[PDB]
Amino acid sequence: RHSRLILAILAGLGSLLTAYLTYTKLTEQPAAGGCDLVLSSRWAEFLGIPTAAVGLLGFLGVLALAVLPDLPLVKRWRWPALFGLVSAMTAFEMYMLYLMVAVLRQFCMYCTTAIILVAGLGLVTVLGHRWLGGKLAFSYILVAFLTLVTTIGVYANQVPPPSPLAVGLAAHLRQIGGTMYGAYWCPHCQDQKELFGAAFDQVPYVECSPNGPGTPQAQECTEAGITSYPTWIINGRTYTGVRSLEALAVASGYPLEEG
* DSSP characters over 97-159: HHIIIIIS----HHHHHHHHHHHHHHHHHHSSS----HHHHHHHHHHHHHHHHHHHHHHHHHS
Cα–Cα distance for residue pair 41/189, rounded to 1 Å = 11
Task: Judge whether 37 is annotated as a binding position.
Answer: no
Task: Judge whether 99 is annotated as a binding position.
Answer: yes
Experimental approach: X-ray
Query: Helix, strand, or coil here: 87?
Result: helix
Task: Catalogue all structural domains in the chain, each as residue range(s) with its CATH number.
Answer: 1-159 (1.20.1440.130), 160-259 (3.40.30.10)
Cα–Cα distance for residue pair 49/59, rounded to 1 Å = 16
Query: Angle of helix 134-158 relative to helix 74-98, nearest 10 degrees?
Result: 50
Query: Phi, psi (5° rounding) for residue 238?
Result: -115, 125
Task: Judge whether 93 is annotated as a binding position.
Answer: yes
Task: Judge whether 109 is annotated as a binding position.
Answer: no
Task: Judge whether 96 is annotated as a binding position.
Answer: yes
Resolution value (Å, 1 decimal): 2.8
Cβ count near 71 (within 10 Å): 8
Residue 43 and residue 99 in contact, taking contact as beta carbons nearer than 8 Å: yes
Query: Angle of helix 74-98 relative to helix 109-126, nearest 10 degrees?
Result: 140
Query: Phi, psi (5° rounding) for residue 43?
Result: 100, -25
Task: Judge whether 95 is annotated as a binding position.
Answer: yes
Cα–Cα distance for residue pair 149/147, rounded to 1 Å = 6
Task: Judge whether 180 is annotated as a binding position.
Answer: no
Cα–Cα distance for residue pair 71/229, rounded to 1 Å = 57
Task: Judge whether 43 is annotated as a binding position.
Answer: yes
Task: Judge whether 228 is annotated as a binding position.
Answer: no
Dihedral of the alpha carbons of 163, 168, 169, 173, in degrees to the nearest 10: 150
The two beta strands, 205-207 and 231-234, are unpaired
Q: What number of H helices and E strands is found in the chain?
A: 10, 6
